[PDB]
Write a structure and sequence with these properties.
Complex; transport protein; T6SS Central Spike; part of a larger assembly; 3 chains; PdpA; about 500 residues; mainly beta
């Protein structure tokens, strides 16, 4: 040749789409043993012409969340005991989604889901099941909470100590060269929190990326941590398909349901000032923050005063952040995996020649930062199995000039207390029994309360702001190290000079 | 509905006046009534205390003068930044000593609520060593 | 006439069977550290589990520290690794004929496997009830 909603009513009944001729989705379930390897169950619990009621999959750049609901029959047999009738046993989930329009496009997910204190199975001789989804670096390291002290280890040397997983996947740390700087005193503290939150909190303060990634042929999970984006990643992020076009060719406009905005590139900011309230820092105290995005005007006479707390130490500098402005986020919806685009999360570009979005006409290339997948079993196919799927896919699209890393929510930790004994050397004479000695540079070298004394102090025998870089030697217990390091437990810490004293 | 706030910390320097003689270099002076007027640890001393030289409950209305940074005021006020705060008498002391807070001492200050500030820590000294702890081992006091 | 063992008037009155978690077969190694100089015994000790035939994982820890007071540090908060039990949610449309659906701390035997459950399970007990009583819509308009 108004009434496209009646197509969607028959779609939730069964199908009625175009030009989706075939859609076979599968799940391969393999158990994970004591030593974090794979057992043998065809070697799995293959799902097919749907036994699956509902699967939710959302995924960011870094990871995958989501749930699952399928059906089996019947009770009771030994083949399904160990898998789905016990908590605290990990499970691989290999999802393979094949479509055919005429050419084929394959998406593939790998995920581990296991959870203490939760099993959900329903009845009325057909038994439902409900399983969660996480990417394997999360769900393994979620139930892992160590806390120790490492000395003279760098970050790529720290994470590879705790990475007890090589028969499943691997993580690429060979491109960063910020996570290899030797830290002299590393205090790992997952006290009241996860270790995976520690994995990301020190990843945010080095400004890195993560990528979940699978090979489609065949499944090998690999995590990537690179400080920037180059062609060294994007060699390995080639979408292993053919005829992958861009620029919203007009088969896309045939397959949409909505367009939803989130906020846009604004034109006003709030003046955010920065105060270090300190006597004896004889420079400017107030300084204004710096914005990476110009052509933006401030408001008038509205402030945000971001103070810094004052320690006994000579107060540090300066936490040079930026005023985090707003970017650009379009939510889309669909009823298909889109023909003739790259709806597969690479960190690559998608051009603009058409203005069939809200968007802005002043926008360069684009990228995709999320996907969401609701797959529901069709109600006509429900009764057929009961006697003897659907689609709704969203997207996130952002400006390529605002390419910044995204991070999940985490927990800032709480402190923990250590009792500590002070020593000086090893051979202590009985006339040098209770002496004292001061240490320069994280090594047993003598120093003094002179030599640092920033000059309003040279000068007499006074200290102002109780300067750093002067360290005691403190022995601790021998059981707050790793299980393999033959070091000697000695923590160097700066002086509170006013402990056994007064202002005299 | 609203939010009860959380505190913030200010480093603070103690002074007395403006012209400081070199025999009055590190003296101390106590202030009555939110103005530079002299006072004492007498005159208040609610009477279970007059009496000897004891303090019970460490009475208020006796204030130090504390300079702060010049950048915690408004953008138009030509005042002089001086915050008067009451005494914790037991800072440089014990249940025996009396070492008051002289000028040119640098001190952390909480502001626990509106019109409530306190004194916690000490960030200064006046008698230290300057040698490498292999030549001298000083343990000393300056006085007065 | 209070019977046990799921006599087959119970099977006539059910609506669903819902599981919560089951007796597992793996635990996480949970260690216990008292970080202290001058406690000249072992510092790390492993926690103790009341339920055997359960195997640990490999190279995953949970370090449960103790804070250090000024006091001689106490001992030892001898807890256990709290494992998982066994919880079936049922549903019904009646108060059940020929069982004890009244919360005693007594036993309910097993001769039938018409639950999910496990065949390696001895007697059972009931720890909750829930009651939704709604007025029927035919009886609504009559009073109305």
């Amino acid at each position: 040749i108004q009434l496209n909603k009646l197509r969607s009513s028959l779609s939730r009944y069964i199908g009625y789409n175009n030009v989706l001729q075939k859609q076979e989705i599968t799940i391969n379930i393999k158990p994970i043993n004591k030593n974090f390897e794979l057992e043998d169950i065809h070697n799995s619990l293959t799902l097919k012409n749907p036994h699956i009621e509902k699967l939710e999959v959302c995924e960011n750049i870094y990871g995958i969340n989501g749930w699952l609901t399928f059906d089996l029959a019947y009770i009771n047999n030994h083949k399904d005991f160990n898998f789905l009738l016990s908590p605290n046993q990990p499970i691989l989930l290999d999802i393979q989604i094949n479509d055919s329009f005429h050419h084929k496009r394959t998406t593939r997910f790998i995920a581990i889901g296991f959870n203490s204190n939760s099993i959900d199975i329903h009845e009325n001789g057909v038994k439902k099941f409900k399983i969660q989804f996480h990417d394997p670096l999360k769900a393994l390291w979620t139930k892992h909470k160590p806390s120790y002290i490492a000395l003279n280890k760098s970050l790529d040397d720290i994470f590879k100590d705790n990475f007890f997983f090589d028969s499943l996947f691997s993580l690429d740390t060979n491109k960063s060269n910020n996570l290899k700087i030797r830290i002299p005193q590393a205090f790992i503290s997952t006290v009241n929190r996860n270790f995976y939150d520690f994995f990301i909190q020190q990843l945010e303060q080095n400004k890195c990326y993560l990528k979940y990634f699978c090979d489609k042929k065949s499944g090998k999970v690999s995590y990537h941590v690179v400080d920037q984006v180059d062609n060294d990643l994007q060699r390995n992020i080639v979408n292993s398909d053919e005829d992958l076009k861009d620029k919203l060719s007009p088969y896309d406009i045939s397959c949409f349901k909505k367009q939803i905005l989130i906020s846009n590139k604004s034109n006003f900011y709030v003046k955010e000032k920065n105060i270090c309230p300190d006597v004896t820092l004889n420079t400017q105290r107030k300084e204004d923050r710096k914005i990476s995005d110009t052509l933006v005007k401030p408001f008038s006479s509205i402030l945000k005063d971001n103070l810094q707390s004052v320690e006994y130490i000579q107060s540090n500098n300066d936490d040079k952040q930026e005023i985090i402005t707003t970017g650009f986020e379009i939510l889309l919806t669909s009823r298909n995996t889109l023909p003739f685009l790259d709806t597969e999360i690479t960190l690559s570009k998608l051009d603009n020649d058409q203005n069939y979005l809200l968007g802005a006409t002043d926008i360069k290339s684009l990228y995709i930062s999320q996907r969401k997948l609701l797959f529901k079993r069709s109600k006509y196919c429900s009764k057929q199995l009961y006697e003897n799927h659907d689609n709704s896919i969203t997207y996130k699209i952002k400006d390529y000039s605002n390419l910044t890393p995204e991070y999940p929510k985490y927990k800032s930790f709480s402190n923990f207390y250590i009792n500590g004994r002070i020593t000086i050397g090893e051979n202590v004479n009985n006339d040098s029994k209770k002496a004292y000695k001061f240490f320069k540079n994280h090594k047993p070298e003598e120093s003094s309360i002179a030599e640092f004394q920033e000059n309003g102090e040279k000068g007499t025998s006074a200290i102002l702001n109780s300067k750093a870089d002067i360290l005691y030697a403190i022995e601790i217990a021998k059981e707050m190290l790793s299980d393999k390091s033959s070091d000697k437990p000695i923590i160097y810490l700066p002086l509170k000079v006013n402990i056994n004293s007064a202002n005299n | 509905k609203y939010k009860s706030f959380s505190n913030f910390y200010i480093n603070g320097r103690i002074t007395i006046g403006e012209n400081v003689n070199n025999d009055s270099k590190k003296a101390y002076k106590f202030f009555k009534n939110h103005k530079p007027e002299e006072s004492s640890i007498a005159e208040f001393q609610e009477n279970g205390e007059k009496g000897t030289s004891a303090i019970l409950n460490s009475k208020a209305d006796i204030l130090y003068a504390i300079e702060i940074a010049k950048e915690m005021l408004s953008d138009k006020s030509s005042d002089k930044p001086i915050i008067y705060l009451p005494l914790k008498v037991n800072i440089n002391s014990a249940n025996n000593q009396f070492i008051p807070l002289r000028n040119d001492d640098i001190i952390l200050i909480e502001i626990q609520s509106f019109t409530k500030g306190e004194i916690i820590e000490l960030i200064s000294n006046s008698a230290i060593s300057t040698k490498k702890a292999q030549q001298q081992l000083l343990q000393r006091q300056l006085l007065g």
